A paper describes a structure:
Human cytomegalovirus (HCMV), a ubiquitous beta-herpesvirus causing serious disease in immunocompromised individuals, encodes an abundant immediate-early protein termed [name] that modulates innate immune mechanisms as well as other cellular processes. We show that this IE1CORE domain binds with high affinity to [name] via the coiled-coil domain.
The structure of rhIE1CORE was solved using experimental phases and refined to 2.3 Å resolution (Rwork = 19.73%, Rfree = 24.96%). The main chain of the model was traced between amino acids 41 and 393. RhIE1CORE adopts an elongated, femur-like shape with dimensions of 130×25×25 Å3. The structure can be divided into three distinct regions, namely an N-terminal head region (rhIE1: residues 62–118, 236–283; hIE1 residues 46–103, 221–267) and a C-terminal head region (rhIE1 residues 151–207, 315–393; hIE1 residues 136–192, 300–380) interconnected by a stalk region (rhIE1 residues 41–61, 119–150, 208–235, 284–314; hIE1 residues 27–45, 104–135, 193–220, 268–299). The main-chain conformation differs in the two monomers (Cα-RMSD for all helical segments  = 2.13 Å). This deviation originates from a pronounced kink that is observed in one of the two monomers and that causes a repositioning of the loop that interconnects helices H8 to H9 with a concomitant displacement of the N-terminal half of helix H9.
Numbering used by the authors:
A (entry chain A): 40 to 392
B (entry chain B): 41 to 73, 77 to 342, 344 to 393
The structure:
Amino acid sequence: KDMALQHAVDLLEKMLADEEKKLTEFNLGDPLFESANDDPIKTLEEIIQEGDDVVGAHQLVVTQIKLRVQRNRRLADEIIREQLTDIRKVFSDKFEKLEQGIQNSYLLLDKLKTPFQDMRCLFEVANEQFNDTPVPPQYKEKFMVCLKQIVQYAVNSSSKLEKFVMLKIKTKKDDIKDRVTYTCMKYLLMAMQGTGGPKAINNEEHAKLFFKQLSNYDDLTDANHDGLELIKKLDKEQKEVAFHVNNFTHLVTTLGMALYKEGHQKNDEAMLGMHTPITMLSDQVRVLILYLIDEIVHAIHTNSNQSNDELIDGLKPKVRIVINEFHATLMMGIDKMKFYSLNELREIVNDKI
Amino acid sequence: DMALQHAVDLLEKMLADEEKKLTEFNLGDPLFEDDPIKTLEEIIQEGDDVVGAHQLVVTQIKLRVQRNRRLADEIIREQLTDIRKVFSDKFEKLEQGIQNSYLLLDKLKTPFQDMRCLFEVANEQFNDTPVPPQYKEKFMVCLKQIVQYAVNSSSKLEKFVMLKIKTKKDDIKDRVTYTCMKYLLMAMQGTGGPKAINNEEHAKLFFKQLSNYDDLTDANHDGLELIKKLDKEQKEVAFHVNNFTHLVTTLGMALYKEGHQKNDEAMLGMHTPITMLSDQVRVLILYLIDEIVHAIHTNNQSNDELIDGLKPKVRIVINEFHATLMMGIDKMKFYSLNELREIVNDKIN
């Protein structure tokens, strides 16, 4: 589909669905039937007030433990299920925010190409340098005529510089989308890896052992005593549940937070990454105009015999060479910011010729 | 000993080297001496003397080009300190981040030193396990012992856990120190300025063609244009300072956010393993309780017989934890008491 992070969103769905399925499965040791006993849970007070005799107390204590083990396991199961619900909530919200932010980064990145559209900046920089270049008056018109034509030739020959900018921009767009997607998937795995709460619950095991040794109690006042103490503990906070709730909440929150940042992070990686190439090419454009201007005035001075056409013509290969040189340099993607001097351009041109 | 010590070194190294190549901003004392640079206003009042004004014009151009060069360097000189201030601050903050994390990883392993936690869980589960008072003694005797065995039989498990926290401490210093350098370069690889200067190129052309001006007033006029532009340049130094400040700040934040994000990812990587290991310890204990009670409540055996019987089951379980822990988090799990039985049964045969 058309979401930048569509793969992340798909994987979130699949994992939750699979996990939600594993919750209802039957695993070894599970009873054939879970107990859903109707009768209401009575408070410790009520049990104390109703247990006149040691045998009536026992009846009351056993059943009230069983009702409570039932209640506690249900709430524990609910909490296991809410882990998945919480993962859906936190990661859906983070993906939506991340997606809205990737879309903005796309725009931002595309704004970087406008000066280079049809390499229109050559015209604008030529306009400026033409106004600021001093030229003895008797040379101005020829300077003008020849500069116009060779700048226009330069525009027509610099298609690869514009196509480079567009390639780089597209690369950063795809970088952002791939990197954020990978991070999204990574955090999602780490989240699903933390699910599953506790399985064994202390007080439930204690009840299981209690009910095992019910026959081995010589004195029913003793059996009642342990039973009542087990009731108190079954109404207290389940420590292992508390431990795992706080741990899982720390895990998902932190994953959540580490991800909210992520899009602004890859956004900035992209904009920072465009800094050197755009800056180098902007400088190259300027330096090209300056080199063309010096060549032209030097030719005008030193070779008044040849026509405008023959002057312009001798410059065309020099134009092609510099543009080629600029392009190879930018393609190298060094990220070491390199600028050219005119003297550097002349040596490169004087070599190829 | 600072964990990010190499980052800091490389910071002072690079700044220093870059600073060497800069030219001094203030001119020394002239052999023959007052400010040599004269205002636009002053140069204008010279203009009745065309030859006089011409000579003053070419001189003031050449002085302004050298002035503007010195400014260019004064720009970088103000930059390298912005790099220093930003990146010192972030290196310090990141370093504090690492030292904190060092303490948190130490915290994580403390329960497992000498596997002390096995005693603590045993205490709590003991106190809470219901048992007839005429068997309470048999329960206590058999539990204290077999838990002590479990502690003694877990030394290879323990040493592995410590090693994994040790390895993770080393991995944090290395990842964050990478992030620090990668971003130091960008602040460096992206400092300086262009080689070809517009006004300098214009000036060079002017002088190239000065002899072809038939009429000095044309030359004088062009020269004054050049001087105005050279002065506009000198007045744009702040703009390039600010722009590079914005740039370094952004590099600094992305530096901080990445070092931090890397730090937190390594800690979270330990979190769930540690959460499962602590649960596995608790389930082991509950499993030992259950065994003992089953073997006491039903089946004419002694404590030694019972306890002897439990030792192979213990080591099987601890080995199971150890083995899954080595395979990694994908092979690690929370256990039911009956999955321990399952495992213990499966291995014996």
